[PDB]
């Protein structure tokens, strides 16, 4: 009746244990799934049009401090002043500026120049950098239409176009300067469905934005996300205002943690990254750049002053970040600090770092400061540093910093295992995970911190090359097509795999109206073809008709090469010969190879017929419908 | 020597069912816990305060 309940309950609640253990694992992953980055784009002063430029510059100890620009119409004559307290003047005349801010391609998005001059430059930079970042991911932007990808960004108002305007520009100034438009505008270009959010949290704005996206990504509200920052100064008044506080270095260079720190330095920049769930990224096979592990955001609250920070708040947010990531301080190795270079801020941050990380370190951890090369990039600043870390992780190298003469004396440098990067050091893989940390502290008091980890090891696969391959390229304009051809040739001058290049071209690119194709079998052949390209056809197609001829097309050795080339055609011709076998008296394969007299109608006509049938099959194989 | 397992298995497994069902309820509430409103203030035209 119920005597054999033993085995029954055994199997029953063994299954119960399995199911609900799986449930527990699911809840742990949903509350703490790591995130993955699959593409970055950056634009910084000094001609940094790619992460490679930034990595090269930091590896070569290159500064980017320049003089005030003049294109923006600023009246620098009445602003530069050795006198420090004269009204409406600045005692500095240097900084890291993005001198290429004005230029923009409105035609690519089909926008009339009226809006182009109307809209703020920051929106244009956001659009272009977003397109660049999406391209870097190897994802077709067109295919994103109708998808549910969200978007978050951080920016602050600049008063661009605050003066009186011509009556022609009516109907564009509002949306041109409307903040909430910007992110949404991007969606309008790409037709996305995810939420569009713009935030304002001073310098930390970018990092906070990223954190926000993470939460949404964990809640199943989107499949993938884009986040970044941008900052372009319309007027230099801030300089003058900061001249009042005397907090600006007359040299215009931030000497972070150096004993000769005397101020700060402003700068501009744009940066965008793409985030996705780790499991989904592995499922899609997207190449993983880095893994984002933990984030934390808090508020300074009551302190010494309105803008005076407190070390304890920074310690609290650091502990919260570590707890969320579930990692001990001993597990991290390198930190990119705020590195403002101010007299007062640096000691507090350093003491907080000593109190937090400087406890029981097996090895002296290292800290860096990107601002010493570029200055304070404000809203974008944060995300910029992240990219730097990623490159340092990819090259297995630890870049050094600049303007280091003597560590500040306010810090007991023997209180913990803390050392600076005066020189580059190798950071090889060892079998144990490598981790890095970033922090940011806004003037308003809000603070954020991030902890990221190296990507999982990947297994390369060797693929044989091919005899010959085609190379395609598409663009919206002929000149853009020429520029793309030039860039592709320049890259092809190096050492790459032709098959890999062809596959990437046919897989990780969109299709446009301006098109060009070159068939190559060697790298030098490819270079010659690319440099020799001269024409492109933007012709509207009509209707396709497959014309069939009569006679006279034949010649010696008809079906010899392509038989060995394309197996599908070989199968088709074999099937045709088998079907016509009940009436032949010769080897059709031989005669098409050229082993029979083709001057006989009873031979040539079936042979030509089979040739045409096979060619029609081949043309079908490439998806051509007559 | 193994006749002492059936009852132990039964007890273990009642405990497991109970606790992990409670855990599942916890995760459901974490996903969708309702929120309560406790304070409210406003300022609108028409003299409303």
């Amino acid at each position: 009746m119920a005597s054999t309940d033993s085995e029954k309950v055994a199997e029953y609640l063994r299954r119960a244990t399995l199911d609900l253990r799986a449930a527990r694992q699911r809840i742990r992953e949903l509350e703490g799934e790591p995130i993955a980055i699959v593409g970055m784009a950056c634009r910084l002063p000094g001609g940094v049009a790619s992460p490679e430029d930034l990595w090269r510059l930091v590896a070569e100890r290159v500064d980017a401090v320049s003089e005030f620009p003049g294109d923006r119409g600023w009246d620098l004559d009445s602003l530069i002043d050795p006198d420090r307290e004269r009204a409406g003047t600045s005692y500095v005349g240097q900084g890291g500026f993005l001198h290429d801010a004005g230029e923009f391609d409105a035609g690519f998005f089909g926008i009339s120049p009226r809006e182009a001059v109307a809209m703020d430059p920051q929106q244009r930079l956001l659009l272009e950098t977003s397109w660049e970042a999406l391209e870097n991911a190897g994802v077709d932007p067109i295919a994103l239409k109708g998808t549910d990808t969200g978007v978050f960004s951080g920016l602050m108002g600049q008063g661009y176009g605050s003066g009186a305007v011509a009556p022609e520009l009516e109907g564009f100034v509002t949306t041109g300067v409307a903040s909430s438009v910007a992110s949404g505008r991007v969606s309008y270009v790409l037709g996305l469905e995810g939420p569009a959010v713009t935030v304002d949290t001073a310098c930390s704005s970018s990092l906070v934005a990223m954190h926000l996206a993470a939460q949404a990504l964990r809640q199943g509200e989107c499949s993938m996300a884009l986040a970044g920052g941008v900052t372009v100064m319309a007027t230099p008044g801030s300089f003058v205002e900061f001249s009042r506080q005397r907090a600006l270095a007359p040299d215009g260079r931030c000497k972070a943690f150096a004993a000769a720190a005397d101020g700060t330095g402003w700068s501009e920049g744009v940066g965008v990254v793409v985030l996705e769930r780790l499991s989904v990224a592995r499922e899609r096979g997207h190449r993983i750049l880095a893994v984002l592990r933990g984030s934390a955001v808090n508020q300074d609250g009551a302190s010494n002053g309105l803008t005076a920070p407190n070390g304890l708040s920074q310690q609290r947010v650091i502990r919260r970040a570590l707890a969320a990531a579930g990692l001990a301080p001993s597990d991290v190795d390198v930190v990119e600090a705020h590195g403002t270079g101010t007299t007062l801020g640096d000691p507090i941050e350093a003491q907080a770092l000593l109190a937090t990380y400087g406890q029981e370190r097996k090895q002296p951890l290292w800290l860096g400061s990107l601002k010493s090369n570029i200055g304070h990039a404000q809203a974008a600043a944060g995300v910029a540093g992240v990219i730097k870390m990623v490159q340092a992780l990819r090259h297995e190298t630890l870049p050094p910093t600049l303007h280091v003469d003597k560590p500040t004396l306010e810090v007991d440098w023997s209180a913990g295992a803390i050392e600076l990067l005066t020189e580059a050091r190798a950071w090889p893989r060892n079998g144990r995970p490598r981790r890095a940390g970033v922090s940011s502290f806004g003037v308003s008091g809000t603070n954020a911190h991030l902890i990221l980890e190296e990507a999982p090891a990947e297994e390369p696969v060797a693929a044989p090359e091919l005899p010959v391959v085609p190379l395609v390229v598409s663009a919206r304009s002929t000149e853009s097509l020429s520029g793309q051809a030039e860039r592709l040739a320049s890259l092809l001058e190096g050492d790459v795999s032709l098959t890999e290049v062809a596959g990437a071209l046919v897989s990780r690119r969109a299709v446009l109206d301006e098109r060009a194709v070159v068939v190559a079998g060697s790298r030098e052949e490819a270079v010659t073809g690319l440099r020799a390209l001269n024409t492109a056809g933007s012709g509207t197609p009509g209707k396709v008709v497959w014309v069939f001829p009569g006679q006279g097309t034949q010649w010696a050795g008809m079906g010899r090469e392509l038989l060995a080339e394309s197996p599908v055609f070989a199968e088709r011709i074999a099937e045709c010969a088998a079907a016509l076998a009940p009436w032949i008296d010769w080897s059709l394969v031989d005669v098409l190879r050229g082993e029979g007299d083709l001057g006989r109608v009873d031979v040539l006509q079936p042979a030509c017929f089979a040739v045409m049938v096979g060619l029609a099959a081949v043309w079908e194989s490439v998806g051509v419908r007559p | 020597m193994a006749s002492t397992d059936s009852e132990k298995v039964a007890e273990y497994l009642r405990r497991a069912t109970l606790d992990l069902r409670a855990a599942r309820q916890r995760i459901r509430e974490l996903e969708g816990e309702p929120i309560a409103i406790v304070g409210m203030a406003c300022r609108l035209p028409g003299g409303v305060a």
Partner: antibody
Amino acid sequence: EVQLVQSGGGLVQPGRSLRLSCTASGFTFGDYAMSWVRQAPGKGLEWVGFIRSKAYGGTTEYAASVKGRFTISRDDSKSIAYLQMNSLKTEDTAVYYCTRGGTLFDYWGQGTLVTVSS
Amino acid sequence: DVVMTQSPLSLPVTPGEPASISCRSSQSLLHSNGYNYLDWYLQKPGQSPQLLIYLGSNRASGVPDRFSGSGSGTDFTLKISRVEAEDVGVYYCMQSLQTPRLTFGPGTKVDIKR
């Protein structure tokens, strides 16, 4: 993950023999006890047989309807079950399934159609 | 002596609605351990059978959370908060205390209301 592969089906004359192989993967096969259940087309579900596990000795039990004609065997080393048709009849034509768990049929295979006709 | 169970034969349903299916037994499946022995299985049209419910209350993994069950003694009930289109097919409430279980019975066919 747990996955089942069923093979050995087809069309068979009356009164012949056949072998059905079920292969299990993605878990530890040695613990569970397996079962076989068929379904005639346009009908319900009827139990056929089952085999225990070596923990309890791995005895076998069969339905009296096909008693002595179909046999169940298991291979723990290869973790594959074998079910043998003997003295087949047309009415036995059905789609068959093998399931993990003697009492709980939690996991099911892709099924296998077997038709008996002359 | 051989226990048996009965459920409503068929019930048209409307997508997005709650639904409830009763299953009443010829005896109390409750055992000295403190458990009833009844499970609920579902077969979709032209697909392998799938397990839904076991020990009356607790729900197996993979099953959507919209399903639930309750009852005791000789009476039990499966409930679904939200009816969806793909949930058409046949369901079986089958005992497990009495062995050897032989046949699944006629079950219950579900269909779209119109």
